[PDB]
Amino acid sequence: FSSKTEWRVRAISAANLHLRTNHIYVSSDDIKETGYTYILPKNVLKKFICISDLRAQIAGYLYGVSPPDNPQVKEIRCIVMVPQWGTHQTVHLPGQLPQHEYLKEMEPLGWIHTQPNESPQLSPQDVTTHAKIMADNPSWDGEKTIIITCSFTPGSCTLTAYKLTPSGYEWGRQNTDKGNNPKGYLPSHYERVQMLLSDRFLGFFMVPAQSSWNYNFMGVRHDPNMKYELQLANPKEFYHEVHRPSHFLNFALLQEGEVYSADREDLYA
């Protein structure tokens, strides 16, 4: 980013993200039928789209349970936002997975992220990210956890859901190179999975304890090994004042400017 002009164009843009919110598409494609099927409550989806930005990827972590007596469907009941920052093609979020009390009741279902340009494939950066989570986390089950990619289409939003195949998981555990075309990448690595939106139940948010989630505007304050706690509260928007301290901390001024126009007229209170 240009860090001056580049900030503002996208900033007055993102104030319209809520317009997208009511036009969304969902990939319908061939159902494995032996697979799990994930239901995403619409409210969290709306809010998640609304906090995002149209260039930097933001990501969120999925937490849910399967409804009683129906083990093959996973309701996503919660999204957790952790300290993070994006690129246009990927997202850097820390090594620690969410730990918190409200979360103990549910299982992790993977993660969801915004995708500035729509691609009909799981980006190598993603399969690599996911495998590398999975390597370090037994908590995440290969077969149960997914990557939901939410892409910004014109005036719209459109989303797909992927699972790593074991081929993919091994490649990704192995993979170093984060470029858009790493060696040995294959369409054999991922698999699409069945997902539905729902108005039947409401999902909720988990959000960083002492800060907010969006570190894009401080990259030096973000570290892979950084630790965080959580709370029950909603995410602030991308360009929200808090995510942007450096800019509100731009004041170089001498007080005596106030000497000029010392006619104080007030008369009201």
Binding site: A15, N43, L232, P245, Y260, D266
Partner: protein
């Protein structure tokens, strides 16, 4: 006749206060016109003082009354005019008007008018006791207000009376200015503050208002003064309580018109003095310039300045008023460089080289301003901008005459007072950002600055020189000699004025509107000069009173307000209705075009980017435009702003936006035009942004109310949030702040660090302590929440706010304001919000707020409870409330349908003797009764009947009683009600119903065990309250009279829900246990209001579902119309006061001719509200409308009265009922009401239960009440409210019954939900538990832990626990869940009971009562009480100790604390035999100690606390005996 719409545009006066209504002017005597090239110059000489009249002398400060003389020190004699009117000043309440020239010293006249009132309240042994009166001084200018409070303070300080400026934001300083008298303010301030109601707590304590410089009537600001005074007068006509009004004006014609306006009797009240009375005679010079081209003009005026100034260059003094900031010093240095260009001519401003102190001007050398250049020479400059102290240092220099040339601004004339030998006004034109252009300065500005001409002391006569444009030259003559009419600009503002009056409720309809306008200055002007105001004389003759013009006028205002949605007013009725938009508009003094712009523009989804634009579109800014020259700088500013404007290009929107940002971002601007503009924008911005916040918050749209309150704060504080909060403490160094901003270390992480750890971050350790202070000065709340589900739809939230910050009144001041708002799952919708205000006293005291919130069908992961300071920026705390574990209650089955039955005649029961006690009362039983009948009467089984209060369940009980009557001669029946009042109320009926007609003996239980025992068993029907029937019947095993009862009746069982409910629950349960052991069935009949969970109650009390009748509140014999009225004023006094008028209106609307009961929060409030009902009764022009008999008939009743005011209120048909009234007085009032003599009775809330007289309309006023113990208000218990509502029932006659409940904003939704639906009821036994286990263990009903659990299973708690487990903090609905829960329960109850030595627990299994518990159980005393006794009473204790030990008893904490009982009990405690060790006077134990000693000393107290004393004494002996034991 029907009204017609007119155009208010061509009907106003543009360029107001420059108006010049007369087109002809006059010479003075020796005046001449001499025209030069390019400029006409007019000269008038000084006036000739009127020769002293025969035997007319000045008054010294001696010969005027003794008291007032104080504070006049330094002044030996009164001014001629002061001396003229002092008599009427101090000897009459007649209103005043004086017209006297500038310099006559008008203030000291008005001062006397104040010293009279200050004297009206005086005592011998104390002076000027200050809570009787307050005075309001309205002055036109701010500087003038400041300086006036400054000197008034000094002067009046001898009296010790506290006078202050009213700059207060409404809420933080009200309770501050509560203690303030003689408050000074600008008319505007008074108008907003009255529109909000900050005044309505002050008024009626106001006997005097001063209008100073009332000629401001002619200014655009005029309508405000017109609005003030009109309101004051129109109000006095309603209240009949009068006020003095003292007007002060410059000398101008239309004096008699202003007189009419102020209701000044021209005879004794009018005072006029012409321009000859100016203390320093004024020679007037006026030079108008004919030059059209401005380029040549800006030379000509320079040169006129030079010649005029060189004229006085000898021994004399000149003062130049320029209207520019910078040009104060641009005008100087022109004179200087000219004097240098003069070949050193004009110089030597002294008597010599060294003479006249040139070393004075040289030795003062180094100064803050540009003075260093000018000071070595003869002249200098003055203004507010460049310096603070050096202004005072220049004023000192001018007074002592070391500078004979001073160029300055109007704020110098309006500020601290110094004159000049001759003053010169350069140009008269100023820049008006409000008007968007340049315009000639106001009347008061010149009048003030030219009234500075000449000294009172060092001068002979003053001169003044006004350099203006020739075209305005006529105008400025019509002023400074009295030619100018004072006219009203009121028409321009008429739509805005009307709104605010509807908003205050002072105008309901068109008629009240014309009545109001009939009090305006514009009215008398339209009367006496119709020709000017747009009325031809012929149609004036056609309508002499202007009824049809005042009807046409205001009709257009009504239409404008309707079209912008400020008011809903239909032409047919002529009535107005206020909308919240209207209120917001009035409260912020924002125009009605701006507000509709906001209505259409504002949507939930608005970004900051857009919020600013909407702000920029405010109609208040309509004339602001963007100039070519400044579009160069605006672009730079546009790229240096944080919030993108880029939606807009260069147009007014952009200019205003970038300006607001510039101000917040704190940016200095090169152009002067832009500076003034920016100032305008930002000053109006506070009110504007705030009205936005209020609107958008009332809508409930969370995100935008955040963005808008934050904007408000950013405007107030002049910074963005991205800057360190420490900046709001201005006490802090800038470099330190910038330093902590340098390193990014999130602010809330400063609390973890100590004084040293702080300084280590910025490597400035010397600061380490001071920083720390501020970090802990910054307001911080921590908050906890206790949440329990009520119904599947609603949860209850108890928020506990604990102050985490150190209070300093030099920072936080008297009060700190916080919004608490609970937001939904996405932080999208605001489900609920309250305004919470923590006062000074109560920092560190945790406050408890209780409120309900709804839940919805996709049950969400959590809500959020947000709390944010109003004024404080970056100060917020959020609290996730997680539902992850929430278990919602089982949805409630539909109420049993009301069957359609042939209404049962009394002829049903074949018993004639029974028929007799009904037939002559009502012909038919109601559908409820007739549906219950066969089950309750012809059949023997337990029934439950819920129906909402007013359904007639009492005779449903009487059915069962009659059945038992047939069953056996001696048949025994016990009847229970939770309210003792209700019990006596039942007894009075049933004693005649049964004992009188049916010969069957009827009794009513009492305190004493013995007498009570004897009572039952002689009686067939035993009426009692749960506590009386607990103590007796705990021992039931031994008392055969308990066991042998045939029937058992529980009335109002839903009351289980409330406190003193557990005892009810426990006695019904016990009753069942007895029927278990007695082997005979004991029929139980329970009666409740509509109950959602009635099933549980029935299952508990053993009713088959077939005999269970639970009815919906919509089933009532007489239908009810319920209305709820929300009031947004949180401060309870103001709220309670502002619902006064609505009460009257609620009567006139809902029940004009029918009986009306009004319930009130306070014992005393009943009087006051009866009064107010009568005083606003006069308003209607309708007097004594509520009295239905002649005064001759009421005399026999009034002979029995003590209370004198009650006589009055009764005389007009009202009357009241409360604690203090003698039972005869009460009986009388009740009689008068029911008989139909008086149509309205105001009653204390306490009397809702025990009142035997019903009504048609019931109005509940303000559902909160005051509790001294936590020092806060607390809501009416819901069942109470339902009872008050049920008090509107009149089945005999009315086809309907009506209720209006006026309550706070917060409490609105709660009533909307729970008054209509059937009610849920939960058990409280889990909390109040020990006492009963103890007592029961004593009877050996619980022999061991097992028996304890078993006992638990007989309760209603047992029933409910699995129904709504989250309420009882039971975490699962399972079997072992409930089992483990009850287990843990008896476990800890028995443990706590064993710790207290009331029982002994053997083997861990068995239990036995011990000494303590035995005592407790015997005397029916709380167990903690006698434990306290156990650790308190020692070997050496005596009556001194026994008093306090017996006082701390638990049964004495039921004793409450009333409004300001902290001083009362202190005054009593002073004079009692035994003093106390640092007693807190809000504590009921202390109060009972003091009341007890008072009783021992036979001191007669007020009946208020005497009642209390009696109640203490009632239960005293038992406690005493327990101590003996």
């Amino acid at each position: 006749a029907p009204r017609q719409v007119l155009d208010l545009e061509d009907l106003v006066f543009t360029q107001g206060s420059h108006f010049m209504a007369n087109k002809r002017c006059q010479l003075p005597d020796g005046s001449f016109r001499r025209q030069r090239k390019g400029y006409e110059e007019v000269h008038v000489p000084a006036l000739k003082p009127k020769p002293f009249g025969s035997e007319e002398q000045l008054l010294p400060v001696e010969k005027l009354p003794k008291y007032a003389q104080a504070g006049f020190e330094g002044f030996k004699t009164l001014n001629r005019i002061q001396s003229k009117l002092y008599r009427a000043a101090l000897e009459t309440d007649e209103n005043l008007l004086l017209c006297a020239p500038t310099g006559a010293g008008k203030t000291n006249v008005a001062l006397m008018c104040m010293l009279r009132e200050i004297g009206k309240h005086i005592n011998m042994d104390g002076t000027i006791n200050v809570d009787d009166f307050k005075i309001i001084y309205i002055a036109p200018m701010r500087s003038l207000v400041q300086e006036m409070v400054g000197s008034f303070g000094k002067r009046l300080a001898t009296y010790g009376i506290t006078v202050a400026e009213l700059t207060g934001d409404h809420q933080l300083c009200k309770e501050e200015i509560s203690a303030t008298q003689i408050i000074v303010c600008t008319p505007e301030k008074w108008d907003i503050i009255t529109r909000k109601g900050g005044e309505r707590t002050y008024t009626q304590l106001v006997r005097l208002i001063i209008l100073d410089e009332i000629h401001l009537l002619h200014d655009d600001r005029g309508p405000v003064l017109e609005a003030l005074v009109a309101r004051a007068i129109r109000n006095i006509e309603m209240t009949q309580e009068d006020v003095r009004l003292i007007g002060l004006s410059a000398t101008l014609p239309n004096y008699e018109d202003v007189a009419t306006f102020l209701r000044v009797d021209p005879a004794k009240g009018l005072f006029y003095f012409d321009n000859s009375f100016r203390p320093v005679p004024l020679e007037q010079t006026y030079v108008g310039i004919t030059e059209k081209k401005a380029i040549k003009r800006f030379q000509i005026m320079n040169e006129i300045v030079y010649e005029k100034i060189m004229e006085h260059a000898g021994k004399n003094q000149v003062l130049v008023f320029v209207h520019s900031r910078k040009e104060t010093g641009k005008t100087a240095r022109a004179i200087r460089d000219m004097c240098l260009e003069k070949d050193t001519l004009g110089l030597f401003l002294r008597e010599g080289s060294a003479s006249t102190e040139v070393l004075r001007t040289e030795a003062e050398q180094c100064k803050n301003l540009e003075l260093k250049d000018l000071l070595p020479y003869g002249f200098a400059i003055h203004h507010a901008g460049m310096t603070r102290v050096d202004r005072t240092l220049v004023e000192d220099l001018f007074a002592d005459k070391h500078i004979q040339v001073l160029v300055s601004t109007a704020t110098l004339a309006w500020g601290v007072n110094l004159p000049a030998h001759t003053v010169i006004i350069k140009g008269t034109q100023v820049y008006s950002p409000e008007k968007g252009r340049w315009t000639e300065l106001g009347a008061l500005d010149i009048l003030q600055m030219l009234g500075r001409a000449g000294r009172p002391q060092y001068d002979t006569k003053g001169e003044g020189i006004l350099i203006t444009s020739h075209g305005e030259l006529q105008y400025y003559l019509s002023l400074l000699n009295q030619q100018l009419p004072i006219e009203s600009q009121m028409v321009s503002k008429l739509p805005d004025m009307l709104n605010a009056e509807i908003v205050l409720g002072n105008v309901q309809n068109a008629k009240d509107a014309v009545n109001w306008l009939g009090y305006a200055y514009l009215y008398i002007r339209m009367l006496r000069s119709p020709t000017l105001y747009g009325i031809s004389h012929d149609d004036l003759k056609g309508d002499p009173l202007l009824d049809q013009r005042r009807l046409d006028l205001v009709h257009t205002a009504a239409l404008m307000l309707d079209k912008n949605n400020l008011v809903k007013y239909d032409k047919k009725t002529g009535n107005f209705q206020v909308t919240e938009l209207g209120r917001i508009a009035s409260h912020y003094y924002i125009t009605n075009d701006t507000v509709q712009t906001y209505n259409q523009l504002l949507k939930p989804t608005l970004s900051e980017i857009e919020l600013f634009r909407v702000f920029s579109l405010s109609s208040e800014f309509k004339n602001i435009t963007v100039r070519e020259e400044e579009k160069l700088e605006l672009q730079k500013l546009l790229e240096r702003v944080p919030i993108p404007v880029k939606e807009s290009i260069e147009e007014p929107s952009a200019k205003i936006n970038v300006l607001l940002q510039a101000f917040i971002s704190q940016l200095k601007l090169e152009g002067f035009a832009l500076m003034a503009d920016m100032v305008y924008v930002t000053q109006s911005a506070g009110r504007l942004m705030r009205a936005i916040f209020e609107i958008v918050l009332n809508r409930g749209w969370a995100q935008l109310t955040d963005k808008t309150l934050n904007l408000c704060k950013m405007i107030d504080k002049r910074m963005w949030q991205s800057m360190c909060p420490l900046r709001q403490f201005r006490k802090l160094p800038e470099e330190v702040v910038k330093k902590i901003e340098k390193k990014n270390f999130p602010f809330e992480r400063l609390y973890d660090l100590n004084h040293n750890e702080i300084g280590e971050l910025i490597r400035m350790p010397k600061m380490g302590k001071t920083i720390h202070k501020y970090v802990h000065l910054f307001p911080k709340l921590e908050l906890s929440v206790h949440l329990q589900p009520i119904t599947r739809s609603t949860l209850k939230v108890e928020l506990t706010i604990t102050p985490d910050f150190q209070w300093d009144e030099k920072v936080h001041g008297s009060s700190e304001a916080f919004w608490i708002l609970v937001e939904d799952v996405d932080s999208e919708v605001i489900l609920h919000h309250e305004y919470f205000l923590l006062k000074a006293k109560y920092a560190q005291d945790e406050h408890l707020i209780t409120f309900f919130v709804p839940v919805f069908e996709p049950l969400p992961p959590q809500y959020f409870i947000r709390v944010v300071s109003d004024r404080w920026l970056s100060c917020e705390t959020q609290l996730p409330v997680s539902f992850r574990h929430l278990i919602l209650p089982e949805k409630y089955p539909p109420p049993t349908e009301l069957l359609d039955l042939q209404p049962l005649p009394v002829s049903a029961l074949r018993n004639s003797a029974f028929e007799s006690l009904y037939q002559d009362k009502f012909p038919f039983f109601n559908p409820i009764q007739t549906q219950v009948f066969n089950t309750v009467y012809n059949s023997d089984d337990n029934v439950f009947v819920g129906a909402p209060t007013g359904s007639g369940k009492t005779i449903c009980a009487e059915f069962a009683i009659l059945r038992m009557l047939l069953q056996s001669s001696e048949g025994r029946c016990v009847y229970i009600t939770p309210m003792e009042a209700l019990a006596e109320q039942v007894y009075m009926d049933w004693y005649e119903k049964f004992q009188d007609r049916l010969n069957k003996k009827v009794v009513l239980l009492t305190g004493e065990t013995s007498t009570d025992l004897k009572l039952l068993g002689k009686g067939n029907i035993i009426i009692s309250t749960p506590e009386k029937w607990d103590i007796l019947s705990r021992r039931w095993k031994q008392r055969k009279n308990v066991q042998n009862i045939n029937l058992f009746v529980v009335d109002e069982v839903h009351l289980i829900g409330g406190e003193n409910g557990p005892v009810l629950e426990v006695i019904c349960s016990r009753m069942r246990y007895i029927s278990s052991q007695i082997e005979r069935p004991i029929r139980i009949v329970a009666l409740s209001s509509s109950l959602s969970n009635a099933k549980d109650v029935a299952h508990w009390l053993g009713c088959s579902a077939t005999s269970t009748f639970n009815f919906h509140p919509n089933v009532r014999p007489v239908p009810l119309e319920l209305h709820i009225q929300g009031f947004n004023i949180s401060h309870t006094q103001t709220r309670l006061l502002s619902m006064a008028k609505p009460v009257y209106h609620a009567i006139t609307k809902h029940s004009p001719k029918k009986p009306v009961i009004v319930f009130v929060p306070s014992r005393k409030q009943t009087r006051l509200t009866a009064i107010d009902i009568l005083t606003t009764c006069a308003a209607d022009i309708q007097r004594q409308r509520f009295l239905h008999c002649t005064e001759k008939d009421l005399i026999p009743y009034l002979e029995k009265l003590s209370d004198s005011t009650l006589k009055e209120t009764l005389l007009n048909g009202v009357g009241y009922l409360h604690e203090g009234l003698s039972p005869m007085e009460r009986r009388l009032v009740e009689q008068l009401f029911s008989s139909g003599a008086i149509q309205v009775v105001v009653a204390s809330r306490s009397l809702c239960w025990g009142m035997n007289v019903a009504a048609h309309l019931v109005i509940i006023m303000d559902t909160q009440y005051y509790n001294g113990k936590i020092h806060a208000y607390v809501d009416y218990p819901i069942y109470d409210v339902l009872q008050m509502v049920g008090h509107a029932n009149r089945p005999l006659q009315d086809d309907e019954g009506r209720c209006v409940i006026m309550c706070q904003g917060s409490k609105k939704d709660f009533f909307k939900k729970f008054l209509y639906e059937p009610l849920p009821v939960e058990s409280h036994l889990d909390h109040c538990m020990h006492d009963h286990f103890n007592a029961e263990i004593v009877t050996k009903t619980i022999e061991n832990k097992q028996d304890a659990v078993d006992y638990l299973t007989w309760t209603f708690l047992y029933r409910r626990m699995t129904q709504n487990p989250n309420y009882y903090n039971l975490q699962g609905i399972s079997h072992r869940h409930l089992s483990d829960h009850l287990s843990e329960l008896v476990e800890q109850t028995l443990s706590d009971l064993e710790q207290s030595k009331c029982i002994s627990i053997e083997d861990e299994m068995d239990v036995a009562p011990l000494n303590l518990g035995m005592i407790a159980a015997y005397y029916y005393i709380n167990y903690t009480t006698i434990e306290l006794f156990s650790m308190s009473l020692n070997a050496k204790t005596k009556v001194r100790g026994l008093i306090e030990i017996i006082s701390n008893a638990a049964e004495y904490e039921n004793i409450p604390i009333r409004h300001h009982e902290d001083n009362l009990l202190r005054q009593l405690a002073q004079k009692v035999p035994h003093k106390l060790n640092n007693p807190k006077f809000n504590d009921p134990h202390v109060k009972t100690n003091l009341l007890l000693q008072a009783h021992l000393s036979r001191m007669q107290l007020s009946a208020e606390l005497q009642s209390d004393t009696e109640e203490i004494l009632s239960k005293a002996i038992r406690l005493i005996q327990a101590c003996v034991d």
